[PDB]
Design a binder for this molecule. Sequence first.
Ligand SMILES: C[C@H](CCC(=O)NCC(=O)O)[C@H]1CC[C@H]2[C@@H]3[C@H](O)C[C@@H]4C[C@H](O)CC[C@]4(C)[C@H]3CC[C@]12C
Ligand SMILES: C[C@H](CCC(=O)NCC(=O)O)[C@H]1CC[C@H]2[C@@H]3[C@H](O)C[C@@H]4C[C@H](O)CC[C@]4(C)[C@H]3CC[C@]12C
Ligand SMILES: C[C@H](CCC(=O)NCC(=O)O)[C@H]1CC[C@H]2[C@@H]3[C@H](O)C[C@@H]4C[C@H](O)CC[C@]4(C)[C@H]3CC[C@]12C
Ligand SMILES: C[C@H](CCC(=O)NCC(=O)O)[C@H]1CC[C@H]2[C@@H]3[C@H](O)C[C@@H]4C[C@H](O)CC[C@]4(C)[C@H]3CC[C@]12C
Ligand code: NA
Ligand code: NA
Ligand code: NA
Ligand code: NA
Lengths: 303, 303, 303, 303, 111, 111
Amino acid sequence: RMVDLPVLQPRLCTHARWPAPIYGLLVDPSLPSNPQWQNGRVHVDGTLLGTTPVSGSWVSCFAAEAAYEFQSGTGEVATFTLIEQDGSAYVPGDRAAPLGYPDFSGQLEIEVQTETTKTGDKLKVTTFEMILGPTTNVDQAPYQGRVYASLTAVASLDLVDGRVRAVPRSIYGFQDVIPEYNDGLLVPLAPPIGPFLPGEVLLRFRTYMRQLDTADAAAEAIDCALPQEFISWFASNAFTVQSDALLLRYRNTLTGQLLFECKLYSEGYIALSYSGSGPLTFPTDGFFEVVSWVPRLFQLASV
Amino acid sequence: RMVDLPVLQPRLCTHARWPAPIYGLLVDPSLPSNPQWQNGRVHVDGTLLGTTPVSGSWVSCFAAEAAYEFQSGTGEVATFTLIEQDGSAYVPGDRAAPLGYPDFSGQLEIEVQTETTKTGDKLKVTTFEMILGPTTNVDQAPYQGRVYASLTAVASLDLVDGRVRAVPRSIYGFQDVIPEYNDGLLVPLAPPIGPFLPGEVLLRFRTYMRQLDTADAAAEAIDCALPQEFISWFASNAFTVQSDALLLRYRNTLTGQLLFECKLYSEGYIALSYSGSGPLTFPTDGFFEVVSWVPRLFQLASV
Amino acid sequence: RMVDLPVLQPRLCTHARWPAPIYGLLVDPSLPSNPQWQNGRVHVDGTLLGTTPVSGSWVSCFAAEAAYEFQSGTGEVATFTLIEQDGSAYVPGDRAAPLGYPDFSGQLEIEVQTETTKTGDKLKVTTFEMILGPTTNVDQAPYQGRVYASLTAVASLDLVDGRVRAVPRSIYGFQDVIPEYNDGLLVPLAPPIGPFLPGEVLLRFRTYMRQLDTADAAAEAIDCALPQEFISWFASNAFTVQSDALLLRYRNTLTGQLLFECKLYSEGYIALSYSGSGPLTFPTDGFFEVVSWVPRLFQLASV
Amino acid sequence: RMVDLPVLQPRLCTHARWPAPIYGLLVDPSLPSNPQWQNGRVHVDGTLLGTTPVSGSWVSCFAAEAAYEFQSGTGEVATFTLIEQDGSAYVPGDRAAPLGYPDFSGQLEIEVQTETTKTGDKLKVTTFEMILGPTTNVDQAPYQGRVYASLTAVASLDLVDGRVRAVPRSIYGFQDVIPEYNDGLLVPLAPPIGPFLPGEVLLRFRTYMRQLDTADAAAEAIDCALPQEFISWFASNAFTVQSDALLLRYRNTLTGQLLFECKLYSEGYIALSYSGSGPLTFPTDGFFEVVSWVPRLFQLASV
Amino acid sequence: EDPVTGPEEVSGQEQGSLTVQCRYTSGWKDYKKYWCQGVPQRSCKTLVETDASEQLVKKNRVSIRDNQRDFIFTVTMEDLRMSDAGIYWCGITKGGLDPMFKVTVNIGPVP
Amino acid sequence: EDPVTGPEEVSGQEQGSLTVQCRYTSGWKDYKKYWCQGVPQRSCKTLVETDASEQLVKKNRVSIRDNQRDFIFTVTMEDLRMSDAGIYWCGITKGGLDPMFKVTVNIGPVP
Ligand SMILES: C[C@H](CCC(=O)NCC(=O)O)[C@H]1CC[C@H]2[C@@H]3[C@H](O)C[C@@H]4C[C@H](O)CC[C@]4(C)[C@H]3CC[C@]12C
Ligand SMILES: C[C@H](CCC(=O)NCC(=O)O)[C@H]1CC[C@H]2[C@@H]3[C@H](O)C[C@@H]4C[C@H](O)CC[C@]4(C)[C@H]3CC[C@]12C
Ligand SMILES: C[C@H](CCC(=O)NCC(=O)O)[C@H]1CC[C@H]2[C@@H]3[C@H](O)C[C@@H]4C[C@H](O)CC[C@]4(C)[C@H]3CC[C@]12C
Ligand SMILES: C[C@H](CCC(=O)NCC(=O)O)[C@H]1CC[C@H]2[C@@H]3[C@H](O)C[C@@H]4C[C@H](O)CC[C@]4(C)[C@H]3CC[C@]12C
Ligand code: NA
Ligand code: NA
Ligand code: NA
Ligand code: NA
């Protein structure tokens, strides 16, 4: 069956690298042209790349067996022995980390369900600080299945060790650079997004992350190559891939007017022909439609 | 084109009523048989019911214009003037609330991005407590677009009014009962799930919510009728519906062994013919496949 | 078009494995007969093998994104995330390293442009020490795109992270053995040079590297199969290959006297028929001329 | 045989005036329009002009017999008796200096292999400072075969006199003006590049040199008329020159799209018709192709 | 300056009675006062509420009377049972969030 | 604040013994400690290494024992020969660049 796409508008879709709605659609040649994002990566034939999960609820989260301890001078320290978020054992293999593990850098505030032995309480939700990267002095190694988090406290919180699911609360010092997956060593990674033709630029689906910032109030943008609905759409359909890219049309939902034509490369990224120097945003209430297969050298009309 | 289903395993899918992975698949005749869940409701022809959103990042969340104030004896008080989660205006209409608003009861901890006026700080993430239902003394009216939240504080947090996205952090005193949608008055609701034939019971997709509990450590279960991936799958395809139900087969992914057959009613819920009196859980690493259209009175093989 | 060669003299050519002029031309049966050099490898039809670049300015150099930090007891530490020397992204593929990366062993002194934040200074040229191989305790992995270097310093140099081009300054403890390409694991390599007929030995183009040695003042020789001009000559012309080898004559430029006949094998190396036991050097101011195609079994006249 | 050009891309070529890759391709009428560069000068028939060498490893380097001594109040002082870089004697003749000698001005850091008598060391690489020009008070006379370099030191380095090859480490106070070739006296020079037609400007192949700068972090650009690969291409092929110029087309390697047409004058420089006043850069992943011979007055299409 | 205060912990005995005094600031005089039961706080079940007057109101075993001179409304729980134990709240009804104060009630048998 | 320290120069005698103490900071307690030989520094030949425990390890004539209370691992070289002379290193195994301290070992005859 020939590849098709859902009629979903981007503004009603889920971001693939941070669990939030998609708010923006744009091209920006001033940003890095070939990002090596590890989440939100799928081939059109349905092969997931990097750490990309099928469910958007796995994005920028992790699951682990948690071991807690109090360290004087630092506070409550958590050692997370990672597991895949469905409960299957994490085995180091041909990807950077467990599925859905964050693929960006900064200090991430995470939330976990904790059980305490203190009388009068039983189940709580505790916020931990976890440094992702680019470099840390904590020796994070999610590739090996071990990450560390901490929280300032004057005494032990008396937490009970056990299974946890960690969800992201905020990001501090965000950088769109892959984190420390293996204590400074490199890991199997999905390759950089690309290549592009002359004049082609990556189409970006943008959301904004909850952040901690002591001076700047501007929202923190993060981009992904495809909405999560498109990621699971390809994973479910398992289309056969014919050419190197698909010619798509982005049209206004109500009128049908064509907003731009673009190429969905089979490697999982959308390209537009745009020669401008600054960002160019597009309406988020349109829809994509598959036109046909095209070769790599197919020249798009400029937008 | 004849109705088909994604090959996705339930354990890799997203829950439709609480933003978490699906962990369980079961029937339980001791639970309410015709729940009136407002999220996770879609017809097989693609019509969304109740407050069901397409994106899982909308589930049990809301967006609003936030106004903050300090009230002695209460704390920091938030008045949320609701808006649809994509920014389009919320108009009270033929559903209970904005799309994705919680459809359960209890005390909900929510997180929002807050801006402060304190010198040296700017952007923080603040946890608020918001009572959902079943009844409140707060006059919650999400149907009208106004809800109230609070957090204990000894003084004002010096928050700046502005736009927010609120995501759920934990549930306290959970009840699977619709919340106070309109200050005690009734609202347009999706009908109860059903009806079922004699001996037919609802198939439940289960996750467990982060909870606050001072005594019991047992996980808090919440069920939905379909994975969020299935809701958006039907919403995208707009299938033509022929009969009243679809005969489905749930099979093991690796071996192919048939685990059970079931009926996906066109109204958007799955029924099993089940002769037991107690709960029966099923493996979550299987897949659903459509067999054919069947009439309402079609008799299933018992489980 | 029949293969021809430039009349350029070896003494006026560029070495293909260390960026220096060619100073010697010789055969030596006491050295390893079948070296697996990764630079300076080209087929006569123009196919580049291993990490061989076309431009001589790429030879034994690398380009990277540099990350700096100070570590007491070690000094200023550089982490080089490799990139191809033209700025295009380096992707681990069907060769050992980025094009032009050193294919020998020892401790390499490299030079990079560094920017500092120290008041009164801005741009300097800094020498780093980088271990190549044969084995290291550093986990060098140029195949994955990450290598580490250091330089002794009593305090931080306050270097700014950024892009660099690294050129070789000197070699310490040189060994003509492929370096640690992948943290001890194997990588795709160009095969050993060969095979040769009985009595045939490899013709070596020799230069001498800037070296560090605390006792021995004798120059450090390094050999390559072809001058860099011949590599770019074959890469540019894309000749059609007829037989297994080309019969060459090395004649004096002024008088024309024939110095030796040799076979240029299609795999990109020259063989001479030489029965001696010790080294035999030849004048470097001669010229090569193509005579005709010959089969692999063509027996050369002894020198 | 009609003149043709290799399909080599500029970004994969070697710069002809500084030993580095080519990073930029541009025209800039605000720069000196008729430069008298002495390196990187060749006729299309293969005739080398000025000090231009065939091998790129000779570019901005020199060879000498070195004499070292310590002078209190100055430091270690080096007297270099220049020699041609292949070891043949340098004789003052019809050019400015030995082949490859730097043709720009500023303070050049050079590196040479030095042997020491100090116990515990033997072979080192020593960095010297050498003033090139435009004017010096040290009486540099590379045309005569004698230049001086020095490095500050509190005591003698115990250096041994001997043969050296000097390679450039960094440039300080760079000026694209010919150095002091003969102690203030005039020398035989390659003529200024030109002439051009009305509206024609010189095409520049640009690299950036390792520099010393205490305030400005902007890269230090240096331009040449042709890539070093083109110089050795004309020197090796010895084409017959017919007209005053060659009509060339610069096309993108992947698509084949025409970027501009230009005139390669037989005197060894490329002209584009460009009426702007500021710089105009071009993509570096194209290739040049010969169209035909044209007269000097052939009018190019504007770019 | 809390809007409404009371005892943090009170204890009664089976078949006995207990009394709870809820003090409030003068501004809440003309507001309805109530006594509610259970957690979560703001979904508790109102057992008895005044009509903003000083009339005594009795519903089942709970009584309430508002003293609008001393600004204290008094709750009385009669014929106590073990199932009466739990968290209660002094409450003042307003639009939105009510002034509320937590009262823990323990019930035991007679020795 | 150096990670690992030791003697800059030690001298032994033929058929004799020498001992080398490498002190490290507390943070490196649970890391493997080693004694390696030769130059270049970071391509040296590891003679003996611990398993990050306090167990004594011996290979041929070289021994290693990590004291994880005083943060000193002690290297012992027995039955020395003149050919044992050279550059050695106290080492702590890590990802990337190892903490290493240069130890020069001289061996002479007995008078
Ligand atoms: C106590 C918590 C329930 C509350 C919770 O954290 N829910 C997640 C959410 O609200 O998003 C339990 C219930 C089910 C548990 C998960 C499931 O048992 C599946 C899985 C099993 C692995 O052994 C550990 C990880 C992992 C993934 C478990 C982590 C902890 C969970 C999530
Ligand atoms: C300050 C925050 C960004 C941080 C954040 O809260 N992100 C949510 C998350 O991380 O999940 C801003 C950035 C974009 C904003 C949203 C968009 O502007 C669209 C929309 C506009 C409406 O006026 C208010 C709601 C709504 C939906 C906005 C809520 C607040 C958002 C989400
Ligand atoms: C600051 C230096 C310029 C000085 C220098 O190191 N020149 C090299 C030499 O003299 O041989 C900059 C100028 C241009 C830069 C290069 C170019 O931008 C191209 C390329 C871009 C990649 O992102 C990083 C590597 C790489 C290859 C860059 C390395 C650093 C360079 C070479
Ligand atoms: C000690 C150095 C070798 C190390 C070195 O400096 N290599 C240059 C590099 O690595 O680029 C020796 C080895 C061969 C020597 C060269 C050859 O003997 C040929 C020639 C002879 C002339 O009398 C002096 C210059 C010149 C050209 C010599 C300069 C010094 C060289 C290059
Ligand atoms: Na920020
Ligand atoms: Na190491
Ligand atoms: Na400068
Ligand atoms: Na109220």
